[PDB]
Design a protein around this ligand. Structure first.
Ligand SMILES: [Mg+2]
Ligand SMILES: [Mg+2]
Ligand SMILES: [Mg+2]
Ligand SMILES: [Mg+2]
Ligand SMILES: [Mg+2]
Ligand SMILES: [Mg+2]
Ligand SMILES: [Mg+2]
Ligand SMILES: [Mg+2]
Ligand SMILES: [Mg+2]
Ligand SMILES: [Mg+2]
Ligand SMILES: [Mg+2]
Ligand SMILES: [Mg+2]
Ligand SMILES: [Mg+2]
Ligand SMILES: [Mg+2]
Ligand SMILES: [Mg+2]
Ligand SMILES: [Mg+2]
Ligand SMILES: [Mg+2]
Ligand SMILES: [Mg+2]
Ligand SMILES: [Mg+2]
Ligand SMILES: [Mg+2]
Ligand SMILES: [Mg+2]
Ligand SMILES: [Mg+2]
Ligand SMILES: [Mg+2]
Ligand SMILES: [Mg+2]
Ligand SMILES: [Mg+2]
Ligand SMILES: [Mg+2]
Ligand SMILES: [Mg+2]
Ligand SMILES: [Mg+2]
Ligand SMILES: [Mg+2]
Ligand SMILES: [Mg+2]
Ligand SMILES: [Mg+2]
Ligand SMILES: [Mg+2]
Ligand SMILES: [Mg+2]
Ligand SMILES: [Mg+2]
Ligand SMILES: [Mg+2]
Ligand SMILES: [Mg+2]
Ligand SMILES: [Mg+2]
Ligand SMILES: [Mg+2]
Ligand SMILES: [Mg+2]
Ligand SMILES: [Mg+2]
Ligand SMILES: [Mg+2]
Ligand SMILES: [Mg+2]
Ligand SMILES: [Mg+2]
Ligand SMILES: [Mg+2]
Ligand SMILES: [Mg+2]
Ligand SMILES: [Mg+2]
Ligand SMILES: [Mg+2]
Ligand SMILES: [Mg+2]
Ligand SMILES: [Mg+2]
Ligand SMILES: [Mg+2]
Ligand SMILES: [Mg+2]
Ligand SMILES: [Mg+2]
Ligand SMILES: [Mg+2]
Ligand SMILES: [Mg+2]
Ligand SMILES: [Mg+2]
Ligand SMILES: [Mg+2]
Ligand SMILES: [Mg+2]
Ligand SMILES: [Mg+2]
Ligand SMILES: [Mg+2]
Ligand SMILES: [Mg+2]
Ligand SMILES: [Mg+2]
Ligand SMILES: [Mg+2]
Ligand SMILES: [Mg+2]
Ligand SMILES: [Mg+2]
Ligand SMILES: [Mg+2]
Ligand SMILES: [Mg+2]
Ligand SMILES: [Mg+2]
Ligand SMILES: [Mg+2]
Ligand SMILES: [Mg+2]
Ligand SMILES: [Mg+2]
Ligand SMILES: [Mg+2]
Ligand SMILES: [Mg+2]
Ligand SMILES: [Mg+2]
Ligand SMILES: [Mg+2]
Ligand SMILES: [Mg+2]
Ligand SMILES: [Mg+2]
Ligand SMILES: [Mg+2]
Ligand SMILES: [Mg+2]
Ligand SMILES: [Mg+2]
Ligand SMILES: [Mg+2]
Ligand SMILES: [Mg+2]
Ligand SMILES: [Mg+2]
Ligand SMILES: [Mg+2]
Ligand SMILES: [Mg+2]
Ligand SMILES: [Mg+2]
Ligand SMILES: [Mg+2]
Ligand SMILES: [Mg+2]
Ligand SMILES: [Mg+2]
Ligand SMILES: [Mg+2]
Ligand SMILES: [Mg+2]
Lengths: 88, 82
RNA sequence: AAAGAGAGUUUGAUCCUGGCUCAGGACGAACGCUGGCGGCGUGCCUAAUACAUGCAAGUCGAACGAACGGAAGUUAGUGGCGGACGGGUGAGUAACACGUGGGCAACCUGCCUGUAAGUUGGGGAUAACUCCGGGAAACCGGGGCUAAUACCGAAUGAUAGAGUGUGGCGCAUGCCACGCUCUUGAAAGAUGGUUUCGGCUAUCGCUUACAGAUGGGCCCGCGGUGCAUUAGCUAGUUGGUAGGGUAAUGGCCUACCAAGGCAACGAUGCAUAGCCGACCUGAGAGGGUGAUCGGCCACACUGGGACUGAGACACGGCCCAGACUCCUACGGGAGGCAGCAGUAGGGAAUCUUCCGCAAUGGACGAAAGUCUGACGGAGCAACGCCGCGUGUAUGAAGAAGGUUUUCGGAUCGUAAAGUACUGUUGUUAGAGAAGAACAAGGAUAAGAGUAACUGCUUGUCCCUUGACGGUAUCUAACCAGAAAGCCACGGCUAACUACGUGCCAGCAGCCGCGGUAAUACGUAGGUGGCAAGCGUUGUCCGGAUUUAUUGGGCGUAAAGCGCGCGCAGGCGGUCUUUUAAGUCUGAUGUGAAAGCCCCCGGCUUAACCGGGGAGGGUCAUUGGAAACUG
């Protein structure tokens, strides 16, 4: 089951996450299908950059955001679009 | 075994082995008594194709044979019917 | 744009050829002397040797029969999913294993997403439990009782099979769409709202079918190693006919038939080796390597086999055989650190039997939640890279004391000592981060679906969680106080004087120094290179144009076969027309991420870490040009 999740990279006690699409089976920092965006939690206003087009393409093919990703996509505001394109 | 979840697997697989071997050899007997009937051109050759067909695709629903395997064998037996 | 340093050594002296040696850079390094700190990384290269002791794979009572509780509320076994992922190693392997590019009209795919049909009716058991029996123990038999989403029939339902009709087609085998006849193939309930109880209904499920996504299977072109003092190799081998088997084509297997197939464009054999992105060096072309990080492969004490499953011939699963260790009441039993730590051994050589699921990602669950030596952190080691501390300023023709002196002086030396100043570091005491998003739970609002709810999807508020760790980081004060070594000084190569020894002790990369005035041995004074280091050894590239495509040669220095006839191969006079294999050029797809390079930004700077880009192919499809080779 392919799902979108964070990927930890950076230095010791300085994490930086890169939103990727990959299977659950593959390692956390291993194979991935493609990359969507990044996520910096250290910045006090957390800044995130997303494709907003590859995500919606993937979520109509059987992709599920994880716990932290869903908060990111909701705050950015594309799960509304996933709502509207589903029923419309 | 020495992981508690592994002791169950070794003994629950034997129960599946027992049930599978029993009805897998039931399938082969129906085929065994068809091709010999086809050679003799008896009247039983026609209706021995039906339960052999019934045995083959019942095994698919039971899940111990692939649907391509069942579909293939039925076609090849039908040729021998003459 | 980029763009290349030489020196010593054959001779009485010279010019060439030619080897040897040196100056540079890099290690997963080791050893010797020395040793303050912080940040980021790295750490069994040998025995794929043998392994004490702990922990690394479980979960679900919202699928089915118990103990605390006056019968409210929480905890074994059957059953489902997961154990095929995550983690380790480099033995084997010279081949579709890998890299790159294609084909599958010759294939499969649990969980995930969408859509369409339904989820109707029965039956027989068996664990657990309860007795009996056997054995030291592992554990094995017999009798009786019970349930399920466990198991097995039944009704209905195939684009599954057979026989056809039509069309539209393609690459030969063949494909796509629709229609007709006949035969087979399915299922499960659980938790709630409503009504009434009939019944309906929400959520999670269950069966069949088709799509998408994901992960795999098979085939093919090209590419990357030594030996010819290794010339033949092969017999299911090569092709065909019929059948078997597989998810799928195929000698994959079998019977028959024929005798073929490969090789000097290097078969076969021996030796060595996981492959790549990449790393080191180099002006470049190349040469050497494949540790850490990422992708693929093979292996799991040594051989062989299969079961269960969507997926295995399965690291912490099973069966047999072998070697080894252990327990036996002698009948028999139990094991596998190339998982995280750790032990012995080998070695010149490599770390803790630590803390947490707080963050990320996994398995189960409807959810809290449980599991996670993955992963986050901490510990040891100057192993490497980066940063800066061992005090600053002024101060004598010049303190004492070393060391030398043709004895007047010179040098250590503005360095002492003195005065003035600072606290990076230190010691003490006070303040104290980010990493946290959550999930769940509570109110709402809007939607699809409803006879109506419950419930589902999205939005906003309330509440909640830190191993690191009182860590990083500030400000308050006192102290120049606790913090400098290593190698060389004849030339190459920056830096010279005394004393001791007397071909002895000794030095050495090369030339070569030492035989009672040694800038070369040993010690001092002084100096020169670096600095928390500095030297030596081992390995690789460079210099080496010393295998010369870029970039050498064969009269006398090494080097023209004693000469001819000639198969294969290499090369080929002049012009015209055509073709488009070589050649040049445009578009599309791809050459992952990380790394080198370019442009910006964050850590007080750097190392380091982010964002974007570039480069990288004798690559595939397709369109052009016609001078040159064909
Ligand atoms: Mg924050
Ligand atoms: Mg039936
Ligand atoms: Mg001479
Ligand atoms: Mg020379
Ligand atoms: Mg150089
Ligand atoms: Mg050097
Ligand atoms: Mg020390
Ligand atoms: Mg020491
Ligand atoms: Mg090893
Ligand atoms: Mg072995
Ligand atoms: Mg043990
Ligand atoms: Mg634990
Ligand atoms: Mg219950
Ligand atoms: Mg459930
Ligand atoms: Mg239980
Ligand atoms: Mg693995
Ligand atoms: Mg190997
Ligand atoms: Mg390796
Ligand atoms: Mg490929
Ligand atoms: Mg019964
Ligand atoms: Mg019994
Ligand atoms: Mg019984
Ligand atoms: Mg039917
Ligand atoms: Mg039926
Ligand atoms: Mg299903
Ligand atoms: Mg794989
Ligand atoms: Mg094949
Ligand atoms: Mg090849
Ligand atoms: Mg055939
Ligand atoms: Mg063969
Ligand atoms: Mg060979
Ligand atoms: Mg060069
Ligand atoms: Mg190169
Ligand atoms: Mg290793
Ligand atoms: Mg071993
Ligand atoms: Mg199976
Ligand atoms: Mg095995
Ligand atoms: Mg296993
Ligand atoms: Mg394997
Ligand atoms: Mg494994
Ligand atoms: Mg083990
Ligand atoms: Mg044994
Ligand atoms: Mg270990
Ligand atoms: Mg040892
Ligand atoms: Mg030793
Ligand atoms: Mg966790
Ligand atoms: Mg989690
Ligand atoms: Mg779930
Ligand atoms: Mg455990
Ligand atoms: Mg732990
Ligand atoms: Mg770790
Ligand atoms: Mg250090
Ligand atoms: Mg040392
Ligand atoms: Mg004096
Ligand atoms: Mg004096
Ligand atoms: Mg301070
Ligand atoms: Mg304090
Ligand atoms: Mg304090
Ligand atoms: Mg969370
Ligand atoms: Mg919530
Ligand atoms: Mg509401
Ligand atoms: Mg509402
Ligand atoms: Mg909501
Ligand atoms: Mg404090
Ligand atoms: Mg301050
Ligand atoms: Mg002071
Ligand atoms: Mg000099
Ligand atoms: Mg002397
Ligand atoms: Mg010397
Ligand atoms: Mg000397
Ligand atoms: Mg000295
Ligand atoms: Mg000095
Ligand atoms: Mg330094
Ligand atoms: Mg060194
Ligand atoms: Mg050396
Ligand atoms: Mg060269
Ligand atoms: Mg020459
Ligand atoms: Mg010549
Ligand atoms: Mg001569
Ligand atoms: Mg000669
Ligand atoms: Mg001649
Ligand atoms: Mg010729
Ligand atoms: Mg010509
Ligand atoms: Mg020619
Ligand atoms: Mg790349
Ligand atoms: Mg900056
Ligand atoms: Mg970087
Ligand atoms: Mg980049
Ligand atoms: Mg022409
Ligand atoms: Mg033309």
């Amino acid at each position: 089951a392919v799902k979108i999740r964070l990927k930890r990279m950076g230095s010791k006690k300085k994490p930086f996450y890169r939103i990727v699409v990959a299977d659950s089976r593959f390692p956390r920092d291993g194979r991935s299908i493609e990359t969507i965006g990044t996520y910096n939690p250290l910045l006090d206003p957390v800044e995130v950059k997303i494709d907003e087009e590859a995500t919606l393409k993937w979520m109509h093919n059987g992709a599920k955001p994880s716990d932290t990703v869903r908060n990111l996509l909701s705050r950015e505001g594309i799960m509304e679009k996933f709502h509207n394109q589903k029923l419309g | 075994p020495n992981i508690k979840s592994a002791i169950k697997r070794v003994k629950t697989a034997e129960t599946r082995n027992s049930r599978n071997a029993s009805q897998r050899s039931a399938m082969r007997t129906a085929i065994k008594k068809f091709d010999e009937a086809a050679a003799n051109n008896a009247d039983n050759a026609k209706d021995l194709y039906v339960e052999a067909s019934k045995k083959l695709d019942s095994a698919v629903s039971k899940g111990l044979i692939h649907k391509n395997n069942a579909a293939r064998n039925k076609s090849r037996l039908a040729a021998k019917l003459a």
